[PDB]
Write a protein that binds this ligand. Structure first.
Ligand SMILES: CCCCCCCCCCCCCCCCCC(=O)OC[C@H](COP(=O)([O-])OCC(O)COP(=O)([O-])OC[C@@H](COC(=O)CCCCCCCCCCCCCCCCC)OC(=O)CCCCCCCCCCCCCCCCC)OC(=O)CCCCCCCCCCCCCCCCC
Ligand SMILES: CCCCCCCCCCCCCCCCCC(=O)OC[C@H](COP(=O)([O-])OCC(O)COP(=O)([O-])OC[C@@H](COC(=O)CCCCCCCCCCCCCCCCC)OC(=O)CCCCCCCCCCCCCCCCC)OC(=O)CCCCCCCCCCCCCCCCC
Ligand SMILES: CCCCCCCCCCCCCCCCC[C@@H](O)O[C@H](CO[C@H](O)CCCCCCCCCCCCCCC)COP(=O)(O)OCC[N+](C)(C)C
Ligand SMILES: CCCCCCCCCCCCCCCCC[C@@H](O)O[C@H](CO[C@H](O)CCCCCCCCCCCCCCC)COP(=O)(O)OCC[N+](C)(C)C
Ligand SMILES: CCCCCCCC/C=C\CCCCCCCC(=O)O[C@H](COC(=O)CCCCCCC/C=C/CCCCCCCC)COP(=O)(O)OCCN
Ligand SMILES: CCCCCCCCCCCC(=O)SCCNC(=O)CCNC(=O)[C@H](O)C(C)(C)COP(=O)(O)O
Lengths: 88, 104, 69, 178, 459, 56
């Protein structure tokens, strides 16, 4: 059989993984609730590189209109979860 | 009235499955519906299809193809046993034909 | 974990197929057995010459027993 | 897919979308990770060169000639994610998606199997039937007189209210329904 | 022939004296029984037709047509009783009476010994059909359709009446046997040219010939389901049967009087097949397909060879079964969603799988898949046409392609993709509908095993 | 027992009776076309010691 059903917890661990592999983000001060522009001091192009990293992570593409608003890791977790039909 | 006429409203169609969850789609009465199903299936699939196909399959050779094959076999045997041509380009005897005498 | 599979109802197509098979077989199994019994025990006729002065019936010009009947 | 669109895209949105498209097509051209990473940093730099331009006209002309360059230099066969609108698996599982209303036409013998599922479904149907009128009334309350202006819907605001027009969003079939 | 005919007439008072809730059961049972009895006309002598009496006779051309008529009646009853449920008892009995009278007229027309009786019955079929269309038709457009169906037909058939009475005055008889044995060549004169046209145009408009075909989309689309079934399966074949009978007194004129009709039929084959590619209505598509098939039959009859006559017979029978099946399939969906538009309901294979199987099989016989009898007829006609002229293959080849195209287009549009989200009233298939489809399809498949039965007199 | 079920199912004899009557009328019609019975050059035959007609 194929891959086991995704669990929100594995999702969120993975998003945090890619986020601390990003050079412009402080690992010891990044949280699941950290705003990208406001708390971490990034601009729109950093946020675009971040969504592209997330699609490279989870192997599925995110539409531009929807992404414009994924401004914290929790929002990315919620988007991926509601897209791939994970409740827990 | 700003209306044109006194008319009944167009009713919604009723689902035969609502009052009869196994309703066969023949009739509202479940008994009549079941028996309509049974007569259709018996007289169409059992009587006409099977017995009719069998009857047509075993129809006697009134088209005379076996007879024609045996006749051709007799003719071929006799004709190349005697050295005669298998077939003649004339279907009818030229001695029984009386052509118009002069052609110019 | 086992989830529920939303499908349309398969009861009615399955019931139709069972009924059709049932009626077709109900009358077509006896016919198959009868044709086998005839072919085995009765059999076809053999070609023979028309005996002297004899005139056959119209059905005596065919070889299969079912076609003859 | 999930968000209501707006009447138009701003200059900033167009620029971000061109950035993403250029990066993806460059990755298609630059197969390997290191070479793509190099040229993507060069791209980001060339993009940042005009970051703080104040003349809207010249910014627009920069965007226009950038789009012309992208079109001439795009990949004729860019990489597509398999379930994306050009992917090899885009609509692969649409034949397995059956609407939920089909479950009401099931024979009682079919519903005899799965009694708990169907009890819980009757609960969900009760919930929808008892929420509908409040949903309609709320939508009539919160909407301007000249009809709605965007495709945006309001949330629930009272105690036991549900967000209006939720049934066909909540009861989607699934994305791997079988 | 009396043994088949009297019981059919009996069907009339049997349905008028039946209880209100047993009309469909009784009519269906005894219609099937009549069909079984008729099945016995397929035994054919070989050299000549079976002449029961001075008035009636059966042929190998005739036998297949009669069996198809008698078999079509119970199927029409099964297809009708759903949409006629709300109707009063008297009007249901009147509808069944119309169908029975139509069957009676049809059986007699095919077996009449002489042309005047054939003409009278061939024309009598107009009244029940018109009543069915205009009284039980769903749309407002039915009245216009009825007028088109009537007038196109009479404008062709009245010159035929004049020609027939003239021919009996000059020859002394219209009996088909005497007509055949005492046949003499038609000279090349203006009088003979107009006699040829008056003998041919009625059957041309019945087929229909391309350009005189406009009545058929109207009438076949606006009719109730049983009306459409009998209009496509049997009533189109009156033209072919009549032409095959009448072309015995027309030689050798046909050699060149057939040119414009051959041109019209081949090019209009291409035309109606192309029309089927851009059709928004699903019944309209099936109607034009019928036109395309009958163009092929017209070519086969006009070129006057044994292979073309065999192909024409086989194609007439196969078309009659397939077209009726396609109309019934469309009607099931119409009953569900109350619209004829083809893109309204989509992805129906997800909701109705066995009906999708019926759709696939009907679409496969429509495009003449080997070794179905549709392809047998089409291939025989194409070979005869090739002998007639090698350039016909281009037109024939093109037609085969366009037919596959629109057949699979219809299948893909209605069965595949995703279901329309809004329509939620698509209930499971009834046993009645599935049995109707099977009773269309099983006979066609069975016919492949014994091809000679539907081949005709030339065989 | 059978009174009212006869009264409601007697219509099931009409079509079989019509079939029988039609067979009868076909035989009567055959009885009118015997001018060449045992008279054709192809099938003319000598009657058997006891048979009366070559076909009926
Ligand atoms: C289904 C449900 C869902 C619906 C689906 C749709 C269904 C719709 C159906 C509609 C109804 C249709 C009705 C139609 C009826 C038609 C009947 C008919 O026409 O009959 C014809 C015909 C009738 O025969 P006939 O012409 O009257 O007889 C001539 C002879 O006189 C006879 O010769 P004989 O007397 O010498 O032979 C003996 C006799 C008996 O033979 C024997 O007993 C012996 C046989 C040999 C055995 C030898 C070995 C056995 C013993 C060995 C071991 C014991 C000994 C050793 C022990 C000790 C060892 C140490 O032969 C037979 O009886 C054969 C059986 C006949 C059966 C016919 C059945 C017809 C049914 C009609 C109704 C349909 C109902 C359908 C359902 C029915 C249930 C299936 O029967 C057949 O055709 C049988 C076919 C046989 C085929 C052989 C294989 C050929 C294959 C080659 C082609 C394939 C190649 C590859 C192809 C490509 C692949 C890629
Ligand atoms: C060639 C194979 C030989 C096999 C030997 C046994 C064959 C017995 C079958 C008897 C006739 C079939 C009846 C047709 C109606 C289907 C009834 C149905 O609803 O199925 C429900 C039933 C229950 O399934 P389910 O799970 O409840 O769900 C079904 C879903 O609806 C959906 O389930 P599904 O997706 O599976 O769809 C059902 C199936 C059924 O749909 C069909 O389309 C089946 C009919 C085939 C096409 C029909 C028009 C094409 C013109 C050909 C005319 C040939 C007739 C010959 C005489 C046949 C006598 C009846 O559809 C298909 O599988 C695809 C059809 C494509 C077939 C293309 C083949 C072209 C010609 C092949 C050779 C023909 C000449 C043979 C000799 C040649 C020289 C040696 O499903 C089946 O049983 C499947 C049917 C078996 C497939 C038969 C296909 C080949 C047979 C053709 C005629 C047989 C010739 C025998 C002579 C000896 C050789
Ligand atoms: C859904 C599940 C599918 C899986 C199950 C599949 C089961 C197997 C299915 C496949 C069966 C294959 C059977 C192959 C045919 C074998 C028998 C065949 O040969 O019979 C043919 C004969 O078939 C019949 O002629 C069919 C006649 C047509 C039936 C008509 C039905 C009644 C009419 C219904 C209305 C028709 C309307 C249209 C009328 C024109 C030809 O016979 P023939 O080779 O000579 O026989 C030689 C020996 N004889 C002559 C003594 C018998
Ligand atoms: C839209 C679908 C409608 C249905 C289609 C109907 C088709 C009807 C067409 C009839 C086919 C041909 C008719 C007659 C055959 C030849 C016609 C004629 O043009 O040929 C020459 C005839 O010469 C001249 O052409 C005279 C005829 C010209 C006058 C007719 C007017 C044609 C104009 C087209 C009008 C459209 C008619 C259809 C109305 C809808 C042959 O020379 P000739 O050997 O000397 O005459 C042979 C007759 N003989 C032996 C008695 C002497
Ligand atoms: C739904 C549309 C169908 C339209 C069909 C219209 C065409 C029908 C065919 C022609 C109709 C009239 C033919 C007359 C009937 C045949 C009778 C006959 O053969 O007698 C001829 C007589 O021939 C005629 O008189 C016919 C002349 C035409 C008169 C009416 C003209 C109507 C229009 C003619 C052209 C249209 C026909 C084709 C149109 C097809 C439909 C588009 C010879 O007899 P005698 O007078 O004794 O001559 C030898 C002794 N001296
Ligand atoms: C191989 C595939 C083909 C690739 C070819 C593509 C060629 C591309 C060349 C480079 C394109 C340009 O310079 S395009 C020149 C456009 N100039 C401007 O936009 C100046 C004003 N800046 C702003 O409006 C915002 O700061 C903004 C920058 C949007 C960021 O905003 P955030 O920080 O708030 O997200």
């Amino acid at each position: 059989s194929d891959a086991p059903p995704l669990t929100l917890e594995a999702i969120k661990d993975r998003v945090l993984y890619v986020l601390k592999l990003y050079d412009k983000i402080d690992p010891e001060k990044l949280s699941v609730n950290s705003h990208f522009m406001k708390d971490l001091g990034l601009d729109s192009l950093d946020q675009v590189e971040i969504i592209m990293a997330m699609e490279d992570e989870f192997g599925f593409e995110i539409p531009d209109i929807d992404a414009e608003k994924l401004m914290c890791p929790q929002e990315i977790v919620d988007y991926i979860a509601d897209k791939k039909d994970v409740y827990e | 009235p700003t209306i044109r006429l006194q008319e009944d409203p167009d009713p919604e169609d009723e689902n035969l499955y609502e009052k009869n969850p196994d309703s066969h789609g023949y009739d509202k009465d479940p008994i009549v519906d079941l028996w309509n199903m049974r007569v259709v299936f018996f007289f169409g699939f059992s009587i006409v299809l099977v017995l009719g196909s069998t009857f047509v399959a075993y129809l006697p050779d009134y088209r005379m193809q076996e007879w024609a094959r045996r006749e051709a076999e007799r003719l071929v045997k006799y004709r190349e046993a005697n050295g005669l041509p298998l077939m003649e380009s004339n279907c009818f005897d030229p001695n029984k034909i009386q052509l118009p005498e002069d052609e110019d | 974990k086992r989830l529920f599979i939303i499908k349309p109802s398969g009861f009615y197509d399955r019931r139709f197929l069972k009924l059709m098979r049932f009626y077709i077989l109900l009358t077509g199994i006896p016919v198959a057995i009868g044709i086998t019994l005839v072919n085995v025990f009765i059999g076809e006729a053999e070609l023979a010459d028309i005996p002297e002065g004899y005139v056959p019936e119209h059905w005596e010009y065919f070889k299969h027993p079912i076609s003859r009947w | 897919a999930f968000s209501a669109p707006a009447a138009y895209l701003t200059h900033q949105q167009k620029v971000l979308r061109l950035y993403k498209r250029a990066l993806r097509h460059l990755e298609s051209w630059c197969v390997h990770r290191d070479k793509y990473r190099y040229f993507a940093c060069l791209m980001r730099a060339r993009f940042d060169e005009h970051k703080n331009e104040k003349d809207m006209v010249k910014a627009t002309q920069l965007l226009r000639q950038a789009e012309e360059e992208f079109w001439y230099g795009q990949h004729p066969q860019p990489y597509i994610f398999p379930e994306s609108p050009g992917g090899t698996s885009y609509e692969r599982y649409e034949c397995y998606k059956v609407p939920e209303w089909c479950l009401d036409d099931w024979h009682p013998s079919e519903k005899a199997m799965y009694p708990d599922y169907f009890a819980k479904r009757e609960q969900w149907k009760r919930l929808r039937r008892e929420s509908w009128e409040r949903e309609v009334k709320q939508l009539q309350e919160e909407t301007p007189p000249g009809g709605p202006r965007t495709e945006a819907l309001p949330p629930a605001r009272k105690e036991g209210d549900l967000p209006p027009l939720w049934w066909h969003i909540v009861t989607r079939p699934r994305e791997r329904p079988m | 022939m009396l043994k088949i005919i009297i019981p059919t007439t009996m069907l009339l008072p049997m349905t008028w004296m039946s209880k209100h809730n047993m009309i469909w059961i009784n009519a269906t049972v005894h219609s099937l029984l009549i069909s079984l009895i008729s099945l016995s006309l397929l035994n054919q002598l070989g050299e000549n037709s079976l002449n029961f009496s001075l008035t009636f006779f059966s042929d190998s051309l005739s036998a297949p047509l009669l069996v198809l008529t008698t078999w079509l009646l119970p199927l029409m009853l099964m297809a009708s009783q759903s949409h006629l449920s709300k109707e009063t008892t008297t009007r249901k009995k009147l509808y069944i009476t119309m169908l029975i009278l139509l069957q009676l007229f049809l059986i007699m027309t095919f077996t009449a010994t002489e042309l005047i009786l054939f003409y009278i019955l061939f024309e009598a079929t107009l009244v029940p059909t018109l009543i069915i269309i205009t009284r039980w038709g769903n749309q407002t457009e039915r009245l216009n359709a009825g007028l088109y169906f009537l007038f196109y037909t009479l404008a062709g058939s009245l010159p035929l009446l004049v020609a027939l009475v003239y021919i009996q005055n000059t020859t002394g008889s219209l009996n088909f046997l005497i007509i055949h044995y005492w046949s003499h060549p038609l000279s090349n004169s203006w009088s003979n040219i107009f006699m040829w046209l008056a003998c041919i145009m009625a059957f041309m408009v019945k087929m229909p010939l391309y350009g005189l075909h406009l009545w058929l989309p109207k009438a076949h689309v606006e009719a109730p389901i049983a009306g459409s079934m009998v209009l496509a399966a049997v009533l189109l074949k009156l033209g072919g049967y009549g032409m095959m009978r009448i072309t015995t007194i027309l030689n050798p004129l046909t050699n060149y009087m057939a040119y414009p009709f051959l041109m019209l039929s081949m090019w209009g084959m291409i035309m109606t097949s192309s029309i089927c590619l851009r059709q928004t209505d699903l019944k309209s598509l099936i109607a034009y397909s019928s036109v395309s098939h009958m163009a092929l039959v017209i070519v086969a009859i006009m070129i006057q060879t044994p292979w073309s006559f065999m192909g024409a017979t086989a194609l007439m029978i196969a078309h009659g079964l397939t077209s009726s099946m396609l109309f019934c399939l469309a009607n099931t969906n119409y009953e569900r969603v109350h619209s004829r538009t083809m893109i309204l309901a989509r992805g129906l294979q997800t909701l109705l799988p066995l009906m999708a199987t019926w759709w696939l099989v009907a679409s496969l016989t429509n495009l003449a898949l080997p070794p179905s009898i549709n392809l047998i007829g089409e291939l025989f006609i194409i070979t005869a046409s090739f002998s007639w002229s090698n350039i016909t293959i281009i037109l024939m080849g093109m037609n085969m392609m366009i037919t596959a195209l629109y057949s699979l287009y219809m299948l893909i549009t209605t069965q595949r993709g995703k279901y329309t989200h809004h329509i939620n009233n698509i209930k499971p298939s009834f046993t009645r509908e599935n049995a109707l489809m099977a009773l269309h399809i099983l006979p066609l498949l069975l016919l492949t095993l014994n091809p000679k039965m539907i081949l005709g007199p030339l065989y | 027992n059978v009174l009212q079920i006869v009264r409601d199912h007697w219509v099931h004899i009409l079509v079989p009776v019509g079939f029988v009557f039609g067979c009868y009328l076909d035989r009567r019609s055959d009885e009118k076309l015997t001018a060449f019975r045992n008279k054709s050059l192809l099938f003319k035959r000598e009657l058997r010691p006891n048979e009366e007609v070559t076909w009926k």
